[PDB]
Structure formats: structure tokens, C-alpha cells
Amino acid sequence: AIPTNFTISVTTEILPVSMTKTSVDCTMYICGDSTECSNLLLQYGSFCTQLNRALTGIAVEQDKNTQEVFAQVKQIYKTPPIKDFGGFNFSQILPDPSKPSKRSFIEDLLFNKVTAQKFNGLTVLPPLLTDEMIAQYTSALLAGTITSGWTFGAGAALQIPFAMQMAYRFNGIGVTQNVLYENQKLIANQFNSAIGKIQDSLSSALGKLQDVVNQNAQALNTLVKQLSSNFGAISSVLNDILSRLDPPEAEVQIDRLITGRLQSLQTYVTQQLIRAAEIRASANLAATKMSECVLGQSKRVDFCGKGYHLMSFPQSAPHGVVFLHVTYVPAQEKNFTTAPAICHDGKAHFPREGVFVSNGTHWFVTQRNFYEPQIITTDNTFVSGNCDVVIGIVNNTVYDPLQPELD
Amino acid sequence: DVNCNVFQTRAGCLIGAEHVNNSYECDIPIGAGICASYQTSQSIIAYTMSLGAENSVAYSNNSIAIPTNFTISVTTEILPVSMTKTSVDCTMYICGDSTECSNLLLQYGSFCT
Amino acid sequence: NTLVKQLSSNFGAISSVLNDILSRLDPPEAEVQIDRLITGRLQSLQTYVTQQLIRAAEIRASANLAATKMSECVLGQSKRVDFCGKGYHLMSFPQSAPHGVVFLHVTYVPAQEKNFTTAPAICHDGKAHFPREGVFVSNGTHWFVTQRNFYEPQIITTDNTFVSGNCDVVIGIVNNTVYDPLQPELD
């Protein structure tokens, strides 16, 4: 079965990058307005050290994963003024110059798609990179891919027309380059129509990015119920017990409140450390595709989408990244009578990269990538032994192109 | 989270740094896109962080850049493999020289396992 | 060093040493103080062991990452873009290190480059000649063919290109006469 028709499709991959940050104090959470609650906590001072150093380790880990996915090169690439690519419309991935933000029309559609606590000590650490620095790193990769392809991520920036960048992608899988020039207008219409199908689908919530915010908000709401918990006492507020009893007798109730809150703190911090392994594993997975699918052409089967990968177009996303791959999946195919080898004058002719086919009347030779009927020549095959050793072999006369060139 | 060389920044309120109209690389991370440094004598100043040099080759359908010179470089990668090992006893750490501390620990014997 | 401070911690008692309490009080009344010391130390043990297990995932993830480059960058040539250094990887030289490993890759990064007038295809006698692995360039006077890897000016021959259709289907195509190396070999 030799493929006779191809279809260009776009694969969208959603992989999270990092999450939010939250710093919790050791003393403020346990005691709000008391003096004797600042005395019994000194005995458990070694527990706050293991918690303060753990919260700082998460803030430096989520910020480090951002510098490994969106920060790959050290050069800023601007958009060229010439918008000529042979027919491929790239106005949807480039940022709008009229709007003050550095985000394109696709980035704003995905940003709006994914839709009081500091009084107790639940503060939020401000991030490093803002919304303008994340969109700038994504715009530099889109401008460098259409002008260089793969030299901007491994060395100096080299200019190259877009008509030649597409031909260099099919040569890595076996497809010839003459098919692109003979059907350049056909792919230009299928590529623009594929963007409209994805645009209409993403405009009508991302489950891979919404669950990240839900798990972070669920952990903050869990500590709210811990504040009103008595942990086997008569009141959760430590000011109500001291206002009705004496210190020497109420010391057994404050100890149960401090010990009960430490169980929730050791569970909340451990829960964030266990979930940090899933974020770190997803960060290295997203950073791998950034340097392989986007930068250059990855030869890994089923890694940069579904099918033969060509190029990629990374986009920005709140607490995540959006991947846009260009796969190559054939469409229609035809069946032909295949021939393993051809015996001529006692010599078995073996092909180099193609295979002999037959339509019922003649015998042609073509590759296993696209239908390209040619003629039987001597420069495309080679002899190897006789015809008595090959199991399956047919018989066909060689045209011999060099013999006429002599008459 | 305190609202306010007085400088009203977006991430907080830094008192002790003069704001300049220039932009350089990031030296000390602060937050919300704030990078502090110690430059010009020299004092602690605050400015807006940069993103690198802005340059791009103009697109042309009749030009190509062919490399004419190469340079061999050596890249050093440092990746850890393993760490140290430490064994902690269940009874010795909890009790050093006592008899009744070897009786109450039997009730919590499932934790040592 | 964290477990050192745990030894002197009272955990809400009067003394961290369990021998000082029994030396001044009676067993039937001091049993409520020993239980608080044992329970307080179990919290540090369940935290120290859990901390080592969580950090073990980062060491295991770094071990499989270092073992991957050992069998790909060092052993053979890995075709993965940006994995065995920065640029085109050739070979590697692993070294030893205390509690770690040192990798020494040999990258291939170009230096200077020149610009030339590129040609997509060449029309001769009504046939469009397409290259196999190179691209036609021009220095302003002649038309040479070379690959996109290194500057190697050659001549226009028939064994390096192939015909595919006419010259009315290609969008961009120039005009240049083929030298035809096989025709002289006959005179």
C-alpha cells in the first residue's frame, strides 16, 4: 500500500509548567494574640526550622522550572517587517502591534479560557517573571523559527526563506522535496484551514490547567477549617480559654492546640512537597519538548504530536505552556503488486531506497513514502550475486539508459 | 506587603535605593519583575530588568547564510548521582539509659517497623 | 544537625533528659512525662525519614537522567537536539566525581558566515532541475551549488540534480545553463 494523498493536521498539547506560591508563618498561624502561646512554642522551635526551610525550597523550585522551559536562548528575536511566506498566514501567532500587550490573538483566547486570607498568615509570594516577560519569550521563538528554523537555538542566527525551511522537514523522514513545490498552493490552504478548526474548538475550559488552580485553592481552604477546630478541647480561640481560667491550669489546653495545629502544618507542607514531584516531572517533560520539538526536528516516534513531526509553535499560558505541532499523516492510498528483486541477464538487481511496484501492465520503481513512478535504470539499483539465491524474484528487462547515450 | 530614597515599587516598598531610567541585567531577584544591583561612588540602585539584545535578520526569499567557519567548544555538565547514607536506631535515639523507657516503647513497636 | 537540637528539646516538659525526671519523681507519677518525650521524638523521626524519601525522588530522577546521557552521549552519537551539550554533539568523555559525575561533551558551533543569492530550482530545456541535498547559491557573477552545512562550491552537473516536471509549475525558479559533464566524455 503506497500512500497517494497526504493531510496536514495540527496537534495541540497542554502541559503545565509551575504553580502558585504560598508562605505560612509558624507563630502567627498557631498564636494570634497571646503571651503564654509564645512560651510553649519555644520548646517546639526545631519544628519551625524544618517548615521554614521547606517553604523557601518550593519558591526557588517553581521559579527555577520557569527559567528552564520559557528561557532557552539569550537573544531576543523581533518580527520581520516582511510578511511574505508563500501563502501561509502567520498573523494569528504574532503579537498585535496596536495593543500594548505583547500577546497574540491566540494567547488572549487561551488566557480568558482558563478561569482576606492574609489576615491569618496565609500570604502569597509575588512571582518573578510578569505577564509581559513570558509573552516576550514566546514571541522570540516564533520569530526565530520562521527566519532560522534551528540555528537560533544552537548557534548564530542565520536567515533562510520559508519556502526552503519546509522542504528540509520532509527530507528527514523520506519524503522528497519535489512534491512540496508541485503542491505548494494545496498545503497553503490546508494549513490555514487547520488553524480555523482549532480556533473554533478552543473558543468554546482546559482541564490540564484548571485542575492545577483547583488543587492549590483546595489546600488553602483546608487550613481555614483547621482554625475553628478544637482538637479535643472546648474552644479553638486561645483567648477565650485564658479569659475564663488561670494560666497554671490552662496550660494543658494550650499544648493540645499547638500540637493539633502542628499535625496540619506537617501535612500541608508534605502535601506540597509530594505534589512538587509531579510539577517537577511535568517541567522537565515540557522543557524536553521545547528543546526538541520546537528547536530542530526530533526523530522520536510519537513524541512531538501524533505522526511525522515537522515544526512547532510554542505559546504562552497562565501557569502552563501550549504546544502547537504540525503532523504529517497520509490520507488515501493505493495497492500495487510489489516485486522484491528483478532478474535480467543472470544478475539480481536490488533497489537502494525504493521498491518495485506493478499496476498490472508495466513495472515501475518507487519509494515507500509517496507515489512517484519512475523508470528502470542502472543508477538506482545494484547487482548482488546471481538469481538462484533469492527466494522471491520476478523477471523484467532493464531499460539501460547508458547504452543509447552511445549511439 | 507593606504599602508606602523612597521608592514605591509594585512588589513592595524599598527604602534605600535610587531609581534610574536605565536598564541592565538581573543581579538580585526581588519579585514582580524587580532586579536590584550595586552599581554607580557605587550604591544600591533599582531599575527595570532587561530581556537581552533585540536583533533579527530580515526575511528574504532570495538570500541564504552559509557557514564558512567552525569552532570546536567543550561543554561541561555537572549532574549528581547519589548521596550519603545514615542509619538511625529507634530505641537508642528515644532512650539512652533507662528501664521504664524500654516498656512504653513496646506499645509503639509498629512505628519502628 | 537538625536532630541535634531535637535531643535537648523538652516538647512541653521540664527536662529533655529522661534520667533527671526519674531521679526526682516516682515512676507511677512520671509516666505522663515520658510519654510526651517519646511522642515528641516520633514526630521528628517521621519527619526526618519522610524528608529523605522525598529527596530520594530528586536523586532518583537525577540518576536516571545521568544514566541516560551515559548510554547516549558517551556511548554512540545521540541525535537529540540540545541534550548532549549545546549544539551538534560528536563524542563525550565521562569523568569521576565525589557523589556525582562530570560530563565533557564536544560541541560543533559555526563561527563566521556569508550571504549568497539562493536559487530554488534551475530551468534548462523546459525541465526544472531540483537538488538532492544541496541548494544553488550565487556570488553575483556565477551560479554554484552547495549544501547547507559548509561552504563547498561545485559545478552544475546532472548526477547531483534530477528533473521533475516542467518549468511552468514552480513558483520561484531561475534560469541557468547546465554544464552537462557526460556530453564531452563522448567526443
Side-chain angles (χ1 to χ4, degrees), chain C residues 29-96:
Chain C
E29 298 180 359
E31 60 179 1
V32 299
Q33 301 292 151
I34 306 180
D35 203 334
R36 298 181 179 270
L37 296 180
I38 299 180
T39 306
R41 295 178 182 271
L42 290 179
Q43 182 67 21
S44 300
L45 293 179
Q46 295 292 339
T47 306
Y48 177 81
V49 175
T50 306
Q51 183 180 185
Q52 297 293 339
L53 294 179
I54 296 179
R55 294 180 178 180
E58 301 179 359
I59 302 300
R60 181 60 180 270
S62 180
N64 297 123
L65 181 60
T68 301
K69 301 180 180 300
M70 184 62 61
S71 300
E72 296 180 1
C73 308
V74 179
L75 302 181
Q77 180 180 0
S78 180
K79 300 300 180 60
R80 301 179 60 178
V81 180
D82 298 1
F83 182 80
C84 300
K86 293 179 179 179
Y88 298 92
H89 174 262
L90 304 181
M91 64 291 300
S92 302
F93 299 93
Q95 299 292 340
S96 62

Side-chain angles (χ1 to χ4, degrees), chain A residues 145-160:
Chain A
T145 303
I146 61 180
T147 59
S148 302
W150 62 92
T151 63
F152 64 98
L158 307 182
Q159 64 281 357
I160 171 181

Side-chain angles (χ1 to χ4, degrees), chain A residues 353-372:
Chain A
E353 76 287 341
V355 56
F356 303 98
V357 299
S358 179
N359 60 330
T361 59
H362 297 68
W363 296 83
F364 295 154
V365 49
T366 180
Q367 61 180 0
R368 60 266 183 267
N369 301 270
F370 189 80
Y371 198 4
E372 184 179 1

Side-chain angles (χ1 to χ4, degrees), chain A residues 22-172:
Chain A
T22 300
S23 180
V24 181
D25 192 7
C26 207
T27 307
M28 180 55 176
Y29 183 99
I30 301 187
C31 325
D33 280 315
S34 179
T35 303
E36 292 77 11
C37 194
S38 308
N39 300 330
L40 300 180
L41 189 59
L42 299 180
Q43 302 293 150
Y44 300 92
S46 295
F47 293 90
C48 298
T49 304
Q50 300 178 179
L51 297 181
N52 294 330
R53 293 182 183 174
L55 296 180
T56 57
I58 304 179
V60 301
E61 181 180 0
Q62 302 294 336
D63 299 0
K64 183 180 60 60
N65 300 330
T66 306
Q67 301 292 339
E68 298 180 0
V69 180
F70 299 92
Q72 298 291 341
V73 300
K74 301 300 180 60
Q75 294 79 204
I76 299 300
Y77 300 92
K78 183 178 179 180
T79 60
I82 300 300
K83 301 300 180 300
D84 189 9
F85 300 93
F88 299 91
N89 196 334
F90 293 155
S91 60
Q92 301 292 151
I93 59 180
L94 300 180
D96 301 70
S98 60
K99 299 180 180 180
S101 60
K102 300 300 180 180
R103 301 181 300 270
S104 60
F105 184 82
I106 306 300
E107 303 182 11
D108 286 69
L109 181 60
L110 300 178
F111 182 82
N112 300 330
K113 181 181 182 60
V114 181
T115 300
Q117 299 180 0
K118 300 180 180 180
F119 298 154
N120 301 91
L122 302 180
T123 60
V124 180
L125 300 180
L128 180 60
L129 301 181
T130 60
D131 300 359
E132 300 292 338
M133 299 180 179
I134 299 180
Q136 184 68 21
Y137 294 156
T138 60
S139 60
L141 300 179
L142 300 180
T145 303
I146 61 180
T147 59
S148 302
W150 62 92
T151 63
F152 64 98
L158 307 182
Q159 64 281 357
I160 171 181
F162 188 82
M164 301 179 181
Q165 180 182 357
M166 186 67 63
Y168 295 157
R169 302 300 180 180
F170 297 94
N171 301 329

Side-chain angles (χ1 to χ4, degrees), chain A residues 68-69 72 283-294 300 303 323, chain C residues 80-83:
Chain A
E68 298 180 0
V69 180
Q72 298 291 341
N284 297 123
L285 181 60
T288 301
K289 301 180 180 300
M290 183 62 61
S291 300
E292 296 180 1
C293 308
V294 179
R300 301 179 60 178
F303 182 80
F323 294 155
Chain C
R80 301 179 60 178
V81 180
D82 298 1
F83 182 80

Side-chain angles (χ1 to χ4, degrees), chain A residues 50 216 241:
Chain A
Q50 300 178 179
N216 297 18
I241 302 180

